[PDB]
Structures are given as structure tokens and as C-alpha cells.
Design a binder for this molecule. Structure first.
Ligand code: HEC
Ligand code: HEC
Ligand code: HEC
Ligand code: HEC
Ligand SMILES: [Co+2]
Ligand SMILES: [Co+2]
Ligand SMILES: [Co+2]
Lengths: 106, 106, 106, 106
């Protein structure tokens, strides 16, 4: 999917996680975030189009998704074992990763 | 120093970094925040003084300073590279982690 | 490429790095290793193939490539700074992470 | 405690974890490792004695304990859950962090 749609998927499912009651909903929302992040890994953002696909900026772009994916993965571990509030607090910290990439590249 | 002094250190040195002119000034303030974060790591915040030190809430509290310290290290690494403005942007992003802990435990 | 071929790309490029004489060779090789690692991410290894894709085992498998990719990125960071010796030593240390996953899933 | 005594604690408790047989054993050994890495953070290694305490080298040194403490804390999360196999696998991957710092600064 394109970068914009993966970003909507990330945004929509963070909202799902915030308002969720129960493990299964959080787990499904995180699984979809992980898939959208993995898909977005390979995109070139509008503001880096004139940069070489191996420039530091493009490396650091992919590095932001690497951080995000690890955080999603860890939240998924918590959700998978029923720790819903812990998973939600993990999701609130990973918002900071969204913000840091957005400040540099959005 | 106690937890309240550490937080004032963190807060004050965010302002120092924002208005700094050169890499040495950023590096010194970040060093002070790394020390105040490492010191707060072992504190018990008032809202958790009725939980056990070996409790999921205290482990999360401690984990929060570990996150903050890694982000402070990343910003120092930029300062050690002479990248003043980048280190300053990274110091600004710390606020998201400050807030994420405060939401839970302040 | 399949997992086999990703694994063989990782093996070959470690040698490339080991015998490299400039930063551009090391960067190149580390970039191909990052690529193959990301490709190996989504694979299912034989020894887990009668296992649920949601199992702790398959989560751990994926986590192992997340670890590897992070170390490769750190080695790339050093290569971008022209630190051929540091980047080579970091590359050589990747073998511990290679070996650690092999011990579990091979 | 001195750096040697902390490394002895780290080393001895790795071995206990590899040969442990109940949860509390792993948890207690990890808890001790957590403490020893915390203490060691603030030390100066012999090969870095004639370097500025705020040089990149001493910063990288401290950062290596930051990585190690993070990994110990994730292993401890598993142990505190009853996931002892898990946690022992996490223990094996920590060795790579030991080795990487040793190669550089021991
Ligand atoms: C990141 C850089 C920051 C900054 C700038 C601040 N904090 Fe914290 N903080 C935490 C707790 C539990 C408290 C309550 C302390 C108490 O009531 O005793 C605070 C408080 C503060 C303050 C107010 C201090 C006061 O005297 O009332 C300020 C100005 C402040 N902080 C700044 C806990 C945490 C964290 C736990 C993991 C983290 C991380 C931060 N705070 C981060 C920051
Ligand atoms: C990870 C779990 C480990 C383990 C099991 C050990 N270390 Fe370290 N280590 C570091 C340095 C600078 C030294 C030399 C200290 C000196 O010269 O005084 C060591 C040494 C050791 C030893 C040998 C102790 C002896 O006196 O012979 C042992 C058994 C040992 N270590 C175990 C530095 C670091 C780190 C810095 C970031 C990290 C992390 C580790 N070591 C990790 C571990
Ligand atoms: C880089 C490493 C990023 C991370 C991590 C996250 N986002 Fe992002 N996002 C990024 C870019 C470069 C852009 C601009 C894309 C474009 O085509 O202009 C975006 C955009 C968004 C948007 C707006 C999408 C749109 O319709 O234009 C949203 C809603 C968004 N991102 C959300 C989001 C969330 C919730 C994230 C963490 C969970 C996140 N993004 C991470 C780059 C990066
Ligand atoms: C798990 C997270 C792994 C990491 C990290 C690395 N490897 Fe790997 N490797 C893994 C598996 C499950 C296998 C078995 C593949 C199979 O289909 O049986 C392998 C295999 C290899 C091989 C042999 C290739 C072959 O066709 O048999 C090699 C040379 C190899 N692996 C090397 C290697 C290197 C150099 C790595 C990192 C730099 C590395 N592996 C990481 C799982 C995982
Ligand atoms: Co579209
Ligand atoms: Co492929
Ligand atoms: Co768990």
C-alpha cells in the first residue's frame, strides 16, 4: 500500500488501541500496525524524493520504522498474554516515535 | 538529590539546551540531564509508595527513565558530533517521554 | 529471495566487509546485509514450520532479525563516518547474533 | 563495588541462569545482574583511564551498560512471568552485548 495509506492504518489503529476494552481488539490493532509499518519501511517520503536511496536521510528514515516496529512488537507481546493496560501504555510511548520521525520527514 | 530536584534539573536543562549557542553548552546540559535521570531511576514517586519496589508499576517507572536516558544518550551522541541543531531537536522530543511517564505516575 | 539465499547473502557480505579496504565497500556490503535481513524477517524457518505464526517461537524468530537489523544499522552509521576499522569490528560482532538464532531455530 | 567485582557478579549469575531450574533462581540471578550493571555504569575501565570522562569513549562505555541493562530488564520481565525458557534464551543473547563491549574496552 502507499505510504499515506499505511500512515492512516497506523493512525486508525492507535485510536482503536486507546479506546479498547480487551486483549483481542488491542492485539488485532497492533498486528495491523506491525503490517503497515513493515509495508512502509520501503517507501520514499515526498520530502526525501531528491535524496539518494542510500543517503543518511533514507537510512535514518528506515531506522525510524525499525524503532517503531520493535515497539509495536513489544506491545504485541503484552497484548498476546492479556496485559491490555500495559500494551496500551506501550502504545502511548510509541506515539513519541511517530512524532520524532514526523518532525524530521513529514 | 531527591526526585523533585532531579525533575527540576531535567526541566531547567531543557531550557538551557533550547537557548544554547554551541555544542559544548548542549553537551554539558545533556550530561546533567543524564545524571538526574540516572538518579531518579531509583526513586519511588509518591503515587507508587504504596506499591512494592518489585511491582509492575515500579518496573514500568524504572523502564521510563531507561527510555529517557537512551534518548538523552542519542542527543549527546549528536552533540559529540558537533551537530548542535540536531541535538537540539532531539532534546525537544524528550518532552514526549517526559509527558508519557507523568500521565501515568505524576 | 528465499531464506536460504538471504542467509547466503549475509554470509558472503560478512567476508566482503572483513576484506574491505575502504568505507564505500563496507557501506555497500552492510546495505546488502540490511536488505537480506529485512527479506528474512517475513520468512518461516523449517524448524518452526509446524508452528503457529503467532507462537512465541515465531515472535522470537522475527525479534532476532530485528536485533540483527539494528546492529547492521549501527555498523552502517560507523561506515558513513568513514570509520572502516570500527565498522568492521561491529560487523564481526554480528556473528554472535547470527549464532544465537541458529542455536535456537536451526 | 569495583568494576571487577561487578563483572564477577555478572559472570557468575549468567552461569546460574544457564543451569537454573526454577523461576526464582533465574529471577534472582537477573536481579543481581541488574544491580551489578547499574553499579558498573559509573566506573572507569583501565584502558580508558587516561581519557576525558566525557569523551565519546567514556560515553560509548556507559551506553554499553545501558544496552545491557535494557536486555536484563526484558529477561527479568519474562522471568517475573513464569516464562523461564524464554528468559534463558534472552540470557544467551545478552552475551553478545558482553562480548562487544569487551572487544572494545577490556
Ligand atoms: C523529561 C525531560 C522530564 C522533565 C523535563 C520533567 N520530568 Fe518528571 N516527574 C515524574 C514524577 C513521578 C513526578 C512527580 C514528582 C512528585 O510529585 O514528587 C515528576 C515531576 C516533574 C516536575 C514537577 C516537579 C515538582 O516539584 O512538582 C517537573 C517540572 C518535571 N517532572 C519535569 C516522573 C518522570 C519520569 C519517569 C519515568 C520521567 C521520564 C519524567 N518524569 C520526565 C521528565
Ligand atoms: C555480560 C553479561 C558480561 C559479563 C558476563 C562480563 N562482562 Fe565485562 N568487562 C568490561 C571491562 C572494561 C572489563 C575489564 C575490567 C578490568 O580490567 O578491571 C570487563 C571484564 C570482565 C570479566 C573479567 C574480570 C576479571 O577481573 O578477569 C568478566 C568475567 C566479565 N567482564 C564478565 C566491560 C563490560 C561492559 C561495558 C559496557 C559490559 C556491558 C560487560 N563488560 C559485560 C559483561
Ligand atoms: C518515519 C520513520 C515515520 C514514522 C515512524 C511514522 N510516520 Fe507517519 N508519516 C511519515 C511521513 C514521511 C509522512 C508524510 C507522508 C506523505 O505522503 O506526505 C507521514 C504521514 C502520516 C500521517 C498523515 C498521512 C496523510 O494522509 O497524509 C499520519 C496520520 C501518520 N503519519 C500517522 C503516524 C502514526 C500514528 C505513527 C506511529 C504509530 C507514524 N505515523 C509513524 C513518517 C513516519
Ligand atoms: C534468526 C533470527 C537468524 C539470524 C539472525 C541469522 N540466521 Fe542464518 N539462518 C537462520 C536459519 C533458520 C537458518 C536455517 C535455514 C534453513 O532453511 O534451514 C539459517 C541458515 C544460515 C546459513 C546456511 C544457508 C543454507 O542454505 O543452509 C548461513 C550461511 C547463515 N544462516 C548465516 C547467517 C549469517 C551470516 C547471519 C548474520 C549475519 C545469520 N545467518 C543470521 C536463522 C537466522
Ligand atoms: Co492511496
Ligand atoms: Co526475497
Ligand atoms: Co510478558
Amino acid at each position: 500500500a502507499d505510504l499515506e495509506d499505511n500512515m492512516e492504518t497506523l493512525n486508525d489503529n492507535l485510536k482503536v488501541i486507546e479506546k479498547a476494552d480487551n486483549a483481542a481488539q488491542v492485539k488485532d490493532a497492533l498486528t495491523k500496525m506491525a503490517a503497515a509499518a513493515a509495508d512502509a519501511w520501503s517507501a520514499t517520503p515526498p520530502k526525501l524524493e531528491d535524496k539518494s536511496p542510500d543517503s543518511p536521510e533514507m537510512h535514518d528514515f528506515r531506522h525510524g520504522f525499525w524503532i517503531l516496529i520493535g515497539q509495536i512488537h513489544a506491545a504485541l507481546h503484552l497484548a498476546n498474554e492479556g496485559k491490555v493496560k500495559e500494551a496500551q501504555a506501550a502504545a502511548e510511548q510509541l506515539k513519541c516515535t511517530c512524532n520524532a520521525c514526523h518532525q524530521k520527514y513529514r
